[model samples]
Target: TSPLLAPVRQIHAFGDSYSDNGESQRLTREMLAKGIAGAQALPGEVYWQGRWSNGPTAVEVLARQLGAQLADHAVGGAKSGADNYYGWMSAYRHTGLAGQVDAYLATLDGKPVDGQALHFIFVSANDFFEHEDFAGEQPLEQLAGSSVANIRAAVQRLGEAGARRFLVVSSTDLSVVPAVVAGNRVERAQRYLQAVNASLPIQLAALRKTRGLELSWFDHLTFSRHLRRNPARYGLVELDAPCQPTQPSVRPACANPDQYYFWDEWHPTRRVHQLAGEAMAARYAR
Candidate 1:
């Protein structure tokens, strides 16, 4: 077994929709159960049980493999920063990474965190996607740097709050998503994502050195790039097309979700999440 796995008994997660299990759904359900004034309406489909993907998210798979309970504070519309700087109207309403960190700290209630607990932080896709709306307003490097700094601040807070180990995931290339591929901003979005991906490892190394924290960087961008280029090798036949219907009027279900790489325009299928989880588990095991 991996030595890294030995010290991790639980996982505390904070991020955007990708990491969110069912926070939004849970609230919707609770409101419906109460039958409040505005709770009469409920969503017809509970697709993926609150996960954006067709099955368990990568963090869920990782937690299961590690034999640790997950305390997922991720919200679907979350961003790296709390402010609605990018003007993502819908996403701006959800708590950002900073708020998620605050929520996690509140859960501790002033007590020290479990030494064996692992903190997993993943985000930034929302930031990148939202930034594409006004790419010309700011340089890609400036936006990437700001996002990196936001993540680092969260990690710093976690370290101060008694977290010793952290697993930080890099953002994938948003330009390759179906929506971006169909749009005119693919190159610009790709450049923005690349800037962030390239800076994460260096920033993380600096954080590890200064904070004396155990850190692991997951290069999600590279993994996605590889899968996109060699889908057959990864058992994925459809790399660009989404398994689910893009139009709400069409059928919401996927006939063969397993063969596809993505569940929607932005999220991956369960198989990919499972693969990523297993790969990360193996990394910890070593």
Candidate 2:
């Protein structure tokens, strides 16, 4: 069931590479900016000029379609909470989901936040990917609890800071990923992600009562899973293989880049990213 949706004036993003828009890499620039690096986004460029995929990620497309200004704080490999570490030093230094929220709040300098601005959190997959769900040492629902705790804290803080509307993008089914498939842990990984997916809205519901929050659970997980099952629904032909190498580099793209669902082992192609934006706009079109 869909919660009430409303028109947003500005969009803010947190989380990892899913909606990255190259903020981590842009911070590397004294050298890169989202549209400024448009020149280098051609084929065979490293990260299409700092983005993970060949062009703008989902949130960028979301902001553009809604005519909303985006203040992004996404890093390439960030975790959901600060407690977990993926040994990504640069990303850890920049912060995770909670840290991204901290950085953005500091930017406000005590000013009131515009309630109309949608705070977009497209994370959790990284948490699932990065954290060690140890077989012998781990307790049941530990990962699920911790990641939920991370989002609960972040959203509560944002709510205390006067943010009203939130757009939380749920993660994909890890069972479909190439990495999990090779590791033969697809079902196991998918199981925990499902736990988080089922449990999160309840926690958010608690926040709505406690913090007076209005959340738009983007529910992109449902959309993405459907796209994967029926690629032709979105004009995609290739379902199983990635179109390019995992890491961004000078490697050549496949002949039918647009027809492929994934840009690499984990990321989606730009067209796929665009479809996310399209889905969002359709849900809450102004």
Candidate 3:
């Protein structure tokens, strides 16, 4: 029998930490070096490296499972084409987005990308996180709409650049993240996520119908709810705990991440990752 060859397509994953995986900690260290610190470490940091409450993220696990090489464009706490701390909020500048994309494009400098290559677009959650607190101050709904527009524009550009089979995944339920649960009421957070998730399908469906684009949607919020309702059954332990344990001056971390779906304020643990990844791959395979 002949050996099975991997898919011939190259994949580029663009998104935030949930997709970035294990970057929050490193990014936090960088922030510390620059003498900048926020309330708590970013969600990506709290979980640490390869420390997702689940296993590897959907991108990582899917790449390995599909036997395809992946190029990760996921950055911790990144906003639309920009890094939040790097500029989005303070400077309102998008230097990070331009730089990152430029660098990525440079890697393929003169190489042709056609039907043989596949590009995956995943973004939005970070935009919400960055602006959620100031919804009253900044009109997060408008900002979110803009964020999606930016993503859509980027995807269109990729298509114009000769790419085909673009897969775009929408944001998940933020109510399940640690930040909302710790800072606000769960019901409130869930309501907000419900609204957000509701808007997503509508937005994506419109795009699909109008643009005739090929896109895949992953309902992270629903998957998250499943984990919350049944933890141990899904190999999650502390669905009700934080990723990092609390100290005298801080919040509590989960006693065991493997038992929890959320590793920190905003990301999933290894188990969650594994499960979510499995779902994503199955959907893709279909």
Candidate 4:
């Protein structure tokens, strides 16, 4: 018989574009195609069926592996907090991390979710990328501290609403992204990313102890760095350069998509998402 997969009945996700299965892009496409009256289009690339990559996203892969339903609430260009801290006009209307939690709670209608349901939270790259934008406005430490608290509060709310299992994915090394690597402030950006990754576990540990929540931390930072240093190990050859035609408006035509690590400037290819899904299943699925 196959091994039980964590007894999970449902999987709910909240994050930025990483976890977004194309909802934002779809909305944008629909508004353009039908002048705001067209049938609601699914998000992401058209060929991938609403995912940002060539195939299923990590959340879709995990949901399939666990035989659970996926409710992805992530949006592209979302931040950890409101006020458009990054000064990016694109993210102004997008729901931030705290807003995502509130939206999920509203769906619950004050009822508790299943104890077997797994909540996944992965975000903050936008925050890291925009770190310099807010450098003079707020201290880096203060920004990181507030982000962690926001995450903790979201988790706590979920716990109170009956969630028992959580998988928190750490922010990967932002320094490796094409924009940051090409930029002048790679070291400073890396420092901020490192700070967030380092502080996350400590805060989650405290939450686990205080709330009796079953938390499984996924070190995406380490995994991403490993893939960066040793691409051959993951069957990836192109690690830094994004596949050509990085623009989301243009349909990408990658000659060998699996060999490339990133689908765009900041997003990973479906191959990486597949690997991540399999790893999470093996580690967390009982």
Candidate achieving the largest TM-score:
1
Off by over 4 Å in 1: 1-7, 28-46, 83-94, 133-136, 247-252
lDDT of each: 0.76, 0.74, 0.60, 0.73
| Candidate 4 residue pairs in backbone clash | 22-43, 22-44
Candidate 3 Cα deviation (angstroms), residue 179: 1.2
Candidate 4: segments with Cα more than 4 A from true spot: 1-5, 26-47, 82-94, 133-136, 247-252
lDDT of 2 by residue, 1-286 (tens): 4653777669888888777776656443422333333222212254576787877888998888887899878776678875323343433244588778887888888888888898888787777776533342444268777778888888998888888888887667677776667668787777777888888888888887877777777676798888878888778998767787654343567988789877877788888889888887766756
| RMSD to native, candidate 4 | 4.4
Clashing pairs counted in every model = 2, 0, 24, 2
Q: Which has the greatest lDDT? A: 1
| Model 4 lDDT per residue over 72-124, tens place | 88766667765233233333344677777777888777676878778988888
- Decoy 2 TM-score against native: 0.86
* Cα-based lDDT at residue 32, candidate 4: 57
Give the alpha carbon lDDT tens digit for every residue of 220-248 in model 3: 76776776787667766577555654322
The TM-score of predicted model 1 comes to: 0.86
RMSD of each: 3.7, 5.1, 5.2, 4.4
- Give candidate 1's error at residue 285 in angstroms: 2.3
